[PDB]
């Protein structure tokens, strides 16, 4: 889960370390590394989550 | 690189100035060039001759008349001579003049399964005093726990002879252009009636 | 100087003069381009590495400059009894004790001289090469022999 999340979110600018910290502050106790298969099905919606994440991050 | 194919016929000795020289007679018959190796399509530079011509037309796929001088591909086949590119029209003996120096490849006589102390000239053990079941044996072949194995290359018994062998820098005593003959300074490898190739040496 | 044409490249420097031109390789640790009636050479921060390169630079340039307005120099005083020199071509057949006389080729830029039969000098536009080939001759027989034989510099004898 982690190896491919990293691959996917590294494809938008940032890295895994950063992405998870973001979500933490962003208040989305969600992804559940399991359920970041969103990266493969519906990357539309992954993209959204990355925005929220870098929202709390920069 | 000057170079004919040929065959050991046998040896004797002649006299010269005032002493006997030992000589071994090669028949290096006429060697019809059949293929040239270019660096442009082969990558290396060489020439393929042929030797014992005689062949009652059993020649099928390699009929390859394809180079003019296809006059019946030889019984004793054909070998390349590396960097050697003559006036393309057969090579006789004339290339070698008396007093020239030559290397000679050949096929040593075959000793078969040879014992150590022939294969390698070992000492073996005493014909008397102590033991009796090891007169011709090799003795030890290792140490103990370290390294606890036998060295790659160890000299032990096995097949000896029947091998490619080049003896270097023999003198050309004489040459009978007449008969396609070549005389060298004794001792050339293998048995009579054996294929050999004869080149220039590398000397001083 | 007078008939000198001090040219410049990225990392090299070409000095044209009445005797010819020479090629000095010069480090990226400066910006010197054809400047004024002479030439100035500067350098960055006063750290050990730079310091050592300034001065080195300053002289190779100056040596190439004095080379292109004739920079020949160097002479060997040959001593010993049977010992003496003889010019053959622009090459040198000196004889110094061995069971056999000694011949010597001059490469590009260089000529040997035989004023005396026991004196010699080496002409050169370069400099590195001159001092090199000077020693190369001295080699053939250096001195020592609780005094006497062998082929010396302008410098002199010892215990």
């Amino acid at each position: 889960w982690i190896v491919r999340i990293n691959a996917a979110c590294r494809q938008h600018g940032l890295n895994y370390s950063t992405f998870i910290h973001g979500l933490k502050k962003a208040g989305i106790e969600v992804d559940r590394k399991n359920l970041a298969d969103l990266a493969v099905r519906e990357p539309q919606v992954f993209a959204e989550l990355v925005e929220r994440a870098k929202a709390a991050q920069g | 690189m000057k170079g004919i194919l040929g065959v050991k016929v046998g040896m004797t000795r002649i006299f010269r100035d005032d002493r006997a020289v030992p000589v071994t007679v090669i028949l290096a018959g006429p060697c019809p060039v059949v293929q040239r190796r270019t660096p442009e399509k082969d990558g290396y530079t060489a020439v393929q001759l042929g030797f014992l011509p005689q062949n009652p037309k059993r020649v099928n796929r390699p009929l390859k008349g394809h180079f003019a001088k296809a006059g019946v591909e030889p019984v004793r086949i054909l070998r390349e001579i590396r960097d050697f590119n003559p006036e393309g029209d057969t090579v006789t003996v004339e290339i070698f003049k008396p007093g020239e120096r030559v290397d000679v490849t050949g096929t040593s006589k075959g000793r078969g399964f040879a014992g150590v102390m022939k294969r390698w000239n070992f000492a073996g053990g005493p014909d008397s005093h102590g033991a009796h079941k090891i007169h011709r044996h090799p003795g030890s072949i290792g140490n103990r726990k370290t390294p606890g194995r036998v060295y790659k290359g160890k000299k032990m018994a096995g097949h000896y002879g029947a091998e490619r062998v080049t003896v270097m820098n023999l003198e050309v005593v004489d040459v009978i252009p007449e008969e396609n003959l070549l005389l060298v300074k004794g001792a050339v490898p293998g048995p009579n009636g054996g294929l050999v190739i004869v080149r220039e040496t590398k000397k001083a | 100087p007078k008939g000198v044409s001090v040219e410049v490249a990225p990392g090299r420097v070409k000095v044209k003069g009445p005797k010819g031109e020479l090629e000095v390789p010069v480090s990226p640790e400066m910006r010197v381009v054809v400047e004024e009636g002479v030439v100035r050479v500067e350098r960055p921060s006063d750290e050990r590495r730079h310091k050592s390169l300034h001065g080195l630079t300053r002289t190779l340039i100056a040596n190439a400059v004095k080379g292109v307005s004739e920079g020949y120099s160097k002479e060997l005083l040959i001593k010993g009894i049977g010992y003496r020199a003889r010019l053959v071509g622009r090459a040198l057949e000196l004889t110094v004790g061995f069971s056999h006389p000694v011949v010597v080729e001059p490469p590009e830029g260089i000529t040997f001289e035989v004023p005396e039969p026991t004196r010699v000098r080496v002409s050169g536009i370069d400099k590195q090469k001159v001092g090199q080939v000077a020693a190369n001759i001295r080699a053939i027989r250096k001195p020592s022999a609780y005094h006497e034989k062998g082929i010396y510099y302008a410098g002199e004898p010892v215990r």
Partner: protein, 138 residues
């Protein structure tokens, strides 16, 4: 269930050449490509990395004083059969080898590890004598 799992997609090819770059600092990323570790198919048991062609080998920068100092080694199974050959001599002859050795070491060591080392094509160049694609990365 959640087996995110791939299905076989068409393998991509790539051309690259940091001819001016520090090897190791190069070879690292190459390998990360030879495994599908950049793409989120990643599946550890399968081989869906990129095929990779590297033009203009040799030329590579090597830090410090690593000529004569970096020594390469081969032992034949024989007595005194050690060979020691320094970096200088490897670029001098067989420089395609240098970047090859360096990537090998960063690849896993199973059968699948050898399979990926075959996906890596190295030419002291330029000119990579096979054209049928190559989305060059810089």
């Amino acid at each position: 269930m959640k087996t995110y799992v791939p299905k076989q997609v068409e393998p991509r090819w790539v051309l690259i050449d940091a001819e001016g770059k520090t090897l190791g600092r190069l070879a690292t990323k190459i390998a990360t490509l030879l495994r599908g570790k950049h793409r989120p198919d990643w599946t550890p048991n399968v081989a869906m990395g990129d095929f990779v062609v590297v033009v203009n080998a040799d030329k590579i920068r090597v830090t410090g004083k690593k000529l004569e100092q970096k020594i390469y080694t081969r032992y034949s199974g024989y007595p005194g059969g050690l060979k020691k050959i320094p970096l200088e001599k490897m670029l001098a002859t067989h420089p395609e080898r240098v970047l090859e050795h360096a990537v090998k070491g960063m690849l896993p060591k199973g059968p699948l590890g050898r399979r990926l080392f075959k996906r890596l094509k190295v030419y002291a160049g330029p000119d990579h004598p096979h054209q049928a694609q190559r989305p060059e990365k810089l």
